[PDB]
Design an enzyme around this catalytic site. Structure first.
Site, PDB file in Angstrom:
ATOM      1  N   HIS B  41      39.869 -11.483  92.770  1.00 15.52           N
ATOM      2  CA  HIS B  41      41.518 -11.776  93.819  1.00 15.52           C
ATOM      3  C   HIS B  41      42.077 -11.376  94.973  1.00 15.52           C
ATOM      4  O   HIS B  41      42.406 -11.685  95.616  1.00 15.52           O
ATOM      5  CB  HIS B  41      42.878 -12.269  92.287  1.00 15.52           C
ATOM      6  CG  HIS B  41      43.352 -11.157  91.899  1.00 15.52           C
ATOM      7  ND1 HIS B  41      43.512  -9.780  92.780  1.00 15.52           N
ATOM      8  CD2 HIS B  41      43.596  -9.807  90.457  1.00 15.52           C
ATOM      9  CE1 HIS B  41      44.087  -8.895  91.705  1.00 15.52           C
ATOM     10  NE2 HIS B  41      43.714  -8.529  90.616  1.00 15.52           N
ATOM     11  N   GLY B 143      48.865  -1.823  93.602  1.00 14.76           N
ATOM     12  CA  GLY B 143      47.414  -1.605  94.530  1.00 14.76           C
ATOM     13  C   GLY B 143      46.348  -0.887  93.354  1.00 14.76           C
ATOM     14  O   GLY B 143      45.364  -0.045  93.469  1.00 14.76           O
ATOM     15  N   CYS B 145      45.174  -2.470  90.376  1.00 12.39           N
ATOM     16  CA  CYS B 145      44.136  -3.703  90.535  1.00 12.39           C
ATOM     17  C   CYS B 145      42.377  -3.187  90.839  1.00 12.39           C
ATOM     18  O   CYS B 145      42.203  -2.228  91.563  1.00 12.39           O
ATOM     19  CB  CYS B 145      43.717  -4.951  90.883  1.00 12.39           C
ATOM     20  SG  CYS B 145      45.914  -5.818  90.737  1.00 12.39           S
TER      21      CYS B 145
HETATM   22  C1  LIG Z   1      46.351  -4.288  91.978  1.00 14.68           C
HETATM   23  N1  LIG Z   1      45.728  -4.261  93.285  1.00 14.68           N
HETATM   24  C2  LIG Z   1      47.055  -5.712  92.609  1.00 14.68           C
HETATM   25  N2  LIG Z   1      48.804  -4.991  92.670  1.00 14.68           N
HETATM   26  C3  LIG Z   1      49.074  -6.224  93.489  1.00 14.68           C
HETATM   27  N3  LIG Z   1      48.801  -7.404  92.534  1.00 14.68           N
HETATM   28  C4  LIG Z   1      49.802  -8.523  92.198  1.00 14.68           C
HETATM   29  N4  LIG Z   1      50.978  -8.747  92.993  1.00 14.68           N
HETATM   30  C5  LIG Z   1      52.005  -9.993  92.546  1.00 14.68           C
HETATM   31  N5  LIG Z   1      50.952 -11.028  92.121  1.00 14.68           N
HETATM   32  C6  LIG Z   1      49.516 -11.468  91.564  1.00 14.68           C
HETATM   33  N6  LIG Z   1      48.992 -11.922  91.195  1.00 14.68           N
HETATM   34  C7  LIG Z   1      47.916 -11.502  90.157  1.00 14.68           C
HETATM   35  S1  LIG Z   1      46.832 -12.505  89.041  1.00 14.68           S
HETATM   36  C8  LIG Z   1      47.973 -13.678  88.614  1.00 14.68           C
HETATM   37  S2  LIG Z   1      47.580  -9.759  90.973  1.00 14.68           S
HETATM   38  C9  LIG Z   1      48.777  -9.512  91.599  1.00 14.68           C
HETATM   39  N7  LIG Z   1      47.850  -7.200  92.042  1.00 14.68           N
END
Ligand SMILES: *C(=N)c1ncn(-c2ncnc3nc(SC)sc23)n1
Ligand SMILES: *C(=N)c1ncn(-c2ncnc3nc(SC)sc23)n1
Ligand code: NA
Lengths: 304, 306
Positions: B41, B143, B145
């Site tokens: 993503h 941040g 992820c």
């Molecule tokens: C990971 N680094 C991260 N930071 C912010 N998000 C995030 N914010 C909003 N929606 C969202 N959806 C995702 S997968 C369905 S990950 C994410 N991820």
């Protein structure tokens, strides 16, 4: 989201742990530059431990009596000396993995990370607080002595604890890295006990703020209180006094949530007086006092 | 003595964390040999997230669109591919700090250590369990992820989890390192919600055994139960069924303490019925289900405090 008891990443400390053997005793040491620090009780036998004269026990040993193993490699000891209750073994090799570091003495209420080690090999990492009675509630078996506690404050490791012993109630005692005990304990076999402990008030408040930040709000109320009336209640429930310094230290958490410290104090009063009525806070049925205000800020901001 | 939620030492993983940037998105990646693994993503905009076509998003990127930073040094990307929900970025340099490792997909009930990271830099380490509803109860901000979960048995790191997202209830979802989600979750903004969670029964039992090993017997009783009557009761408190596999796995803890598994099952029944009456077990006023049998054996003495 979410709130978890969280330790510092331990990698900078892992690279400093070594095994120290003296006679039939093996425990852990901390290798920084060309010195290995460990508990002086490594030189004692069971009989010695009854009434040890450390000066006299140490002068009888040579350098070569101390076996120091860094992973697979032997280090050569080229000098030994005592500072308070820690032994300093000078070795021939400087640790190439020595991080930037300081020795600090922490206060009751402050938290730190413990890297539990056995045979100079790190096994686990968890978070502890220095209790008001100067013990820690650790998890340590035989062979764990010399394991250390630390905080990381930039790229700088602040070492604050070395493990020496377990008390009869199963809690733990040790020294700073200059070899001074936390609490009224000694490194000999005599009768010793944990004193009666109290709850770290400022930390419980910090955790209440964490809970609000994370959406757990049921205990808030319309009331406020003063420092004096709150401290009357704290005393009654075996809580540490709250000082103006604590109110100041809680400022950032207060500003961020819009709940004044004394407003949160009124919530805590009610929890102490009425209990939780079958409810939980951040998944706990008891009030948690091993997070500092800084711990809460750090985890609910993202510093790295 | 003592008993604490204890993580594995994180140093072997710390030496693998990098920052990955694509456009205006920054998150974490895991650098092993000459591959950086991260959530796919990273290539999406927030608009994309409703119905992303990952194949179509990815074909439009070149190698040099991916910025990978290891501490101070930029790495050069020289290849990319997608496997399930992870991106594998081939880089020019092998990680000199690559530990001995493997990828394992875990089952519900298994625990692991999480190294929460931001901007490729480690922030903290804690212990988590894969919940029966295939989420974890983590602590993760924006941040985070690409942060990973692992065990270290011996000197070998077993990577089992990479973090992808937070669900509306504030729990967390992610993948194995082959990019397969745990649970029915997708890397898509849709109505997806964690199923109702249950307590991990085998782990609660393990923890009861821990408390015995550490010298506490107040919750035991003179009763026993059949497995089936136990399961009939446990399901009424939202406890997971206990299977014969679970009974087997509790054998060593049974032998060490002298308490048969189904006798410990009877104690749990009573605890669920009565609660704790102002008492604690290993310092908790709730029953703890995030320690496995293996976790208990690893941490506790092999000598029961009788
Ligand atoms: C990971 N680094 C991260 N930071 C912010 N998000 C995030 N914010 C909003 N929606 C969202 N959806 C995702 S997968 C369905 S990950 C994410 N991820
Ligand atoms: C640390 N490695 C260690 N293991 C076992 N002990 C220990 N055992 C028995 N008595 C005792 N007394 C100590 S100081 C008063 S430490 C110790 N330590
Ligand atoms: Na109030």
């Amino acid at each position: 989201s979410g709130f978890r008891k969280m330790a510092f990443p331990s990698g900078k400390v892992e690279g400093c742990m070594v095994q120290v053997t003296c006679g039939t005793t093996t425990l852990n040491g901390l290798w920084l530059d060309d010195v290995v620090y460990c508990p002086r009780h490594v030189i004692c036998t069971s009989e010695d431990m009854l009434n040890p004269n450390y000066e006299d026990l140490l002068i009888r040993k040579s350098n070569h009596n101390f076996l120091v193993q860094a992973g697979n490699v032997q280090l050569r000891v080229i000098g030994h000396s005592m500072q308070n209750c820690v032994l300093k073994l000078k070795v021939d090799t400087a640790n190439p993995k020595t991080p930037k570091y300081k020795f600090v003495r922490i206060q009751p209420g402050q938290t730190f990370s413990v890297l539990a080690c056995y045979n100079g090999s790190p096994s686990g990492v968890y978070q502890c607080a220095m209790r008001p009675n100067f013990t820690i509630k650790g998890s340590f078996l035989n062979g764990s002595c010399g394991s250390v506690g630390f905080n990381i404050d930039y790229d700088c490791v602040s070492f604050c604890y070395m493990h020496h012993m377990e008390l009869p109630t199963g809690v733990h005692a040790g020294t700073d890295l200059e070899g001074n005990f936390y609490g009224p304990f000694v490194d000999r076999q005599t009768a010793q006990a944990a004193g009666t402990d109290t709850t770290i008030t400022v930390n419980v408040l910090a955790w209440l703020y964490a809970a609000v930040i994370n959406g757990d709000r049921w205990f808030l109320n319309r009331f406020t209180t003063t420092l004096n009336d709150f401290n009357l209640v704290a005393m009654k429930y075996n809580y540490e006094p709250l000082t103006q310094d604590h109110v100041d230290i809680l400022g950032p958490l207060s500003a961020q949530t819009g709940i004044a410290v004394l407003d949160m104090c009124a919530s805590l009063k009610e929890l102490l007086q009425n209990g939780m009525n079958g409810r939980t806070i951040l998944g706990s049925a008891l009030l948690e006092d091993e997070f500092t205000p800084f711990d809460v800020v750090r985890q609910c901001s993202g510093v790295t």
